[PDB]
Design a protein around this ligand. Sequence first.
Ligand code: ZN
Ligand code: ZN
Lengths: 89, 214, 97, 24, 200, 94, 133
Amino acid sequence: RTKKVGIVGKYGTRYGASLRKMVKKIEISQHAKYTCSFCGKTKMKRRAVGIWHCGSCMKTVAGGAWTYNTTSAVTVKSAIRRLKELKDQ
Amino acid sequence: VVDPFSKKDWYDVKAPAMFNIRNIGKTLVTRTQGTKIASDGLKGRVFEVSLADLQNDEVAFRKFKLITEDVQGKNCLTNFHGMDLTRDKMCSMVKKWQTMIEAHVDVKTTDGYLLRLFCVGFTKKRNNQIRKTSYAQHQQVRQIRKKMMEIMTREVQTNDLKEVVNKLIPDSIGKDIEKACQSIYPLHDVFVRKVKMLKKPKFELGKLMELHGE
Amino acid sequence: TKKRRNNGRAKKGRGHVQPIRCTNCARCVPKDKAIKKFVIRNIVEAAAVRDISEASVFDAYVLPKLYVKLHYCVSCAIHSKVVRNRSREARKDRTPP
Amino acid sequence: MRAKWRKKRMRRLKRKRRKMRQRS
Amino acid sequence: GRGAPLAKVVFRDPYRFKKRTELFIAAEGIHTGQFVYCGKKAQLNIGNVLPVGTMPEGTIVCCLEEKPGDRGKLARASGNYATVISHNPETKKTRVKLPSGSKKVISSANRAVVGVVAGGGRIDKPILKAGRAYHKYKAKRNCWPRVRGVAMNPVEHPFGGGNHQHIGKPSTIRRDAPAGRKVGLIAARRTGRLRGTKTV
Amino acid sequence: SINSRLQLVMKSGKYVLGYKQTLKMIRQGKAKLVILANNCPALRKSEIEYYAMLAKTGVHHYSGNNIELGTACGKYYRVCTLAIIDPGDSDIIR
Amino acid sequence: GPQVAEGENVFGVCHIFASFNDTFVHVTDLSGKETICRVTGGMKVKADRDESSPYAAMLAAQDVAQRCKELGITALHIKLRATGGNRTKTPGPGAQSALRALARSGMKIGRIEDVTPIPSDSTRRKGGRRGRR
RNA sequence: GGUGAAAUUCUUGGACCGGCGCAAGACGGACCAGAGCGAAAGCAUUUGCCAAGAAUGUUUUCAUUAAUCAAGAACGAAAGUCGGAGGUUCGAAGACGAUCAGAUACCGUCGUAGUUCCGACCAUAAACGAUGCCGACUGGCGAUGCGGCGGCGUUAUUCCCAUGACCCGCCGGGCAGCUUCCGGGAAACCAAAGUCUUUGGGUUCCGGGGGGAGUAUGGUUGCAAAGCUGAAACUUAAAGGAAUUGA
Ligand SMILES: [Zn+2]
Ligand SMILES: [Zn+2]
């Protein structure tokens, strides 16, 4: 239907092309449904900013503002596991 | 105006009594003066003591570094904490047209000391051999490296810090690896490149006194 | 035409070489193409060694040597006077003696 | 004219040409 | 009014038969049904509350206590965290890097939550709308539509007035200026585009 | 190599997929191996291990989740609990 | 100084950091935690030019010998360093002359080592990569 | 600290130095070389997993199923753009200090963007072997990798075969020198840059004196910078390649 505007066609011409391009990436990720790591079903939607809910197993997870997992979160979780393992062994 | 050579005192350093020369040197240290502690200050010091002056009939290219543990009045005690072959030896036995093999492994002894051992091997060209290169394939290197992994694990895990350091003093592990590897590829310059610790148990005066009095 | 079959550098197989700074002018040049030499110079000049030796406490057991890696690119290799230009059959040579 | 900086000058004459057509 | 989500955590009272309910700042990764542990013997896991003394160096923490016995005072906004740098067991002090880049010596008995605050990246998305800005501050306070002092009259602002819209005096103002005069750039050590990173 | 052995159970052996069918097989003695995905519910995982202890049968914890275990069984759907009735291959060892 | 017999020697470690701009000779106890002295070619000469020249290094070395002889230390081992790391692995000119004087002054010198920092590969090297002067 | 020689600058609030630790993000030295792998751009710490490939071997299998290729498509050094993570080291732009008649530069100290990872763009280089792919013929000598075959011996697993490793060769696929009146070439130089007038094995891309000009215009891609496709008018008798002796 569109060549490049995608999901930000709802804004028409009403903001800059670059601002619509930046929000295009974020609006795709904030409205996507992800696969739940707990039940395996692709029903992990966003309730509010930082709140992600699964409509099958009814699990609520604290995540990112627009994406389910922030890169800072993954690095910190991997680093804490390394620091914990160094303490134990 | 005031020379700081009087505000300090010298203590004599004694290694564990399992070497040939107990006396190593005299290291100055500041007086307590009611603020600092000379015993805690001397703790954590590391003296590097090669086998040339640690023994009298051993190799002169093996450096032994010792971590202080306790201070007995005018005396200062130490304990083996790591070793490294000299880099002037290092650059001299690596040459052109040859192959080197490393292997790093972390093994913990029963005493609770975690040790990271590095082993080094070099492929040996035979006496009659005339070919310029003497490479070992990726498949031979992997099994040779695995051999150093298994041999070092066996020789360290089941032995204490007492036994392991006594094994490394004649570099017996380096000779054992080379002879065992003669089946796949005889090797010419084989020793242990480095040994470092990672964790220590709680410092105990009884253990240190036993080592220094044995 | 090709002045050199080698095209100056020793790299005929691989595509790229990491650069090394020139000593005389500080210009980046590929290692294999640069004039690289090992220099061993006594710490003390042979004529001047004796003055130090006379004042030396040691029973003639100390002879420190200074070994420094040398790297010249080709623009200033000539200025140094190293690598003086060769004859037409001259180029095809080697170490020199 | 060195080869490269003749190319640079031709590019800069082209960029000026484009702006003239854009404003016209 | 708060970008960071909050976690409702239920504990068990050790002195009488009753369940307690606490409102924590949600570390990113925690989920409903998870068990969180608070104490000096708690393991080093995301969501647990530990004193910073028992934490190793390089640990990432959030909801950190400024002084012992508080209930979390630092690194509380979404996507923010503090880092443990080093300890001093003799004086019982710990150095921590704050989200502004500043470095602070705190008591090692201060507690913190392991991880980063959930809801990070909120500032990445452009607001894009006067209305979205309006809805943002309708939940916070009456501060949003900001008139410029140069657009005012000289009776309501030091920058107001003139036949042109100009400040007329340097906008850098001293620290000791009275309340009605301290407008513009208060105690500016410098002005203009930065070239690098500026810190004390 | 567990995935290759599971592949040969699907072609040649007998099996039940899904949690309700394995409980039936355990309680009537027809289950020889039970495989649990890594994201199996904790209560269900504990219950299966208890059923297997009473029936004296082995429990293997598959490395991946229900999406990957089902793919390992050749199915286009998630599998969380599965029981092997007849191997037909060399999965009897463990 | 320590209370030792005349038959033995007061031993310590000595590092000779060599560069093409200024040579550094420095002496401490075995571990090096406590410090005995430091002399360089910089304090020797008014002009910063001759901090790397041999003649200033000998005068600096004599400074080491006399001030350390005053304290009561005679025997010193040697550990050599170049600029190291990314810079050249070759010690500078201010190494032969400084070691010549510390040998002529009569101080005891024994084992010799090289503890120059030799990376597996350090980071990018200053300069950049093009043009000279 | 650094320069041919000097400095800006960090410095008695203790820099530099040596010792013990912690953190950061890059990169894997001497091994590592006319050696290997990939269609190219490219690829180097140990370990695990996934999928793929050349050569070899074969008395297995289909039996012409066959190679470059209009139109069309995918990957494609480095740099650059957008976006999100931290900036360890280097380092456009920029700043400061020396050198000269000027120095908008070389030298030194910082230093943003960049140099790092991730998603989408950008498709350029001396992407050079300045050297298309498939196929037959067309000297040799000393070597290297793989695989397969034969062996006097040396050596370790040991106590036998066997498994390793060195030496001698053979066979097929290679990256390759070196000499050589094979030959061709204008020569420089090359077993292909040969079998070419004694002219035909198949075929794609691509050139037609030098400029104008990789320009104008049209089309298309891109956020931009720019990329791909791409004339004409007019103007010139030379521009060029190799080699000869001097300077
Ligand atoms: Zn779910
Ligand atoms: Zn140069």
